[PDB]
Write a protein that binds this ligand. Structure first.
Ligand SMILES: NC(=O)C1=CN([C@@H]2O[C@H](COP(=O)(O)OP(=O)(O)OC[C@H]3O[C@@H](n4cnc5c(N)ncnc54)[C@H](OP(=O)(O)O)[C@@H]3O)[C@@H](O)[C@H]2O)C=CC1
Length: 308
């Protein structure tokens, strides 16, 4: 259970190191510690502003002979301002430059949302998405082998369905918020029915993010199962996702928590304790406030998420 198989045939390691909010000065030693500890999957994005420092950590690991390039699964994301079909390859090239890599294992459309190239998220800069024309350009990256798998992030079942109808290369991954607090059963189903892999971002509910109301590790049901099974609350939360057939992208810069989050393979959650999860109140923590707006295509929360 140390990996899942994507629709491309590629194995995606079921635990990756998240690097959202990993500062340029700490992220390098975090990636290093993670890989040394057995991680084979790093989740990155242009907009995280730390890809240069992840690249220095990867080049250290290779030259030090901890791993070779082929042992690692490296993910990055196309930001909202590079959706125009002519801008997509520059975006991938910018991230390959910073990571100092020949290819990405996974390249994702970060949001089903577009702004003018080189502009900030402000309504004046909003441009109607053309996901087919962006996906069209993402396919050319996949053809050339520069992105060995392509996929999307923050797509509902509907938006994922609409892309699959027009795709020549089907999305390999839909990366979404998914944890005990927000279980995404519908999309989980739609993904297994379509052969799309569901990858769980904020798998601990992103408790370090002051503007998200994460308290997943404090839920009575998770604290219980941890105590019952002699595992930490984090361990339980992550294991739940892995038993659902989702990969998890736990972020840490603390060597010990990095180690603990990989320790989700040798042990299981009994079916009894797996039943105890629908006793958990459901709330989406990352609502996409920043792109729900009167001048947005998404005038409502329900419009962004298609009721989900
Ligand atoms: N739009 C998208 O596609 C999105 C993608 N992502 C990706 O998913 C990743 C993971 O989600 P993220 O929102 O970062 O939050 P997570 O759910 O991964 O939680 C991270 C927080 O939990 C702490 N933590 C880590 N390990 C443990 C542990 N074992 N016990 C207790 N606390 C722990 C971290 O602190 P510390 O570092 O001190 O250990 C940090 O404050 C992101 O980092 C990013 O790579 C996430 C958000 C959006």
């Amino acid at each position: 259970a140390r990996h899942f198989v994507l629709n491309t045939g590629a194995k995606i390691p079921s635990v990756g190191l998240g690097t959202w909010q990993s500062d340029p000065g700490v992220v390098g030693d975090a990636v290093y510690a993670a890989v040394k500890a057995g991680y084979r999957h790093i989740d990155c994005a242009r907009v995280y502003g730390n890809e240069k420092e992840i690249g220095l950590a990867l080049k250290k690991l290779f030259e030090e002979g901890v791993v070779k390039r082929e042992d690692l699964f490296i993910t990055s994301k196309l930001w909202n301002d590079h959706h125009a079909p002519e801008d997509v390859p520059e975006a991938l090239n910018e991230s390959l430059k910073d990571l100092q890599l020949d290819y990405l294992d996974l390249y994702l459309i970060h949001w089903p949302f577009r702004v003018k190239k080189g502009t900030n998220t402000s309504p004046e800069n909003f441009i109607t998405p053309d996901i087919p024309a962006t996906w069209g350009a993402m396919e050319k990256l996949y053809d050339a082998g520069k992105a060995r798998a392509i996929g999307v992030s923050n797509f509902s079942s509907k938006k994922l369905g609409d892309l699959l109808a027009v795709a020549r290369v089907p999305p390999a991954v839909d990366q979404v918020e998914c944890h005990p607090g927000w279980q995404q059963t519908k999309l989980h189903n739609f993904c297994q029915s379509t052969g799309v892999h569901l990858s769980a971002y904020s798998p601990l509910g992103s408790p370090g993010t002051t503007w998200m109301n994460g308290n997943v590790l404090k839920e009575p049901v998770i604290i219980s199962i941890a105590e019952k099974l002699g595992k930490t609350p984090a361990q339980v939360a992550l294991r739940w996702n892995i038993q659902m057939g989702h990969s998890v992208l736990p972020k840490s810069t603390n060597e010990e928590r990095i180690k603990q989050n990989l320790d989700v393979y040798d042990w299981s959650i009994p079916d009894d304790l797996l039943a105890k999860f629908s006793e958990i109140k459901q709330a989406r923590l990352l609502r996409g406030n920043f792109i729900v707006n009167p001048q947005s295509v998404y005038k409502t929360h329900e419009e962004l998420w298609d009721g989900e």
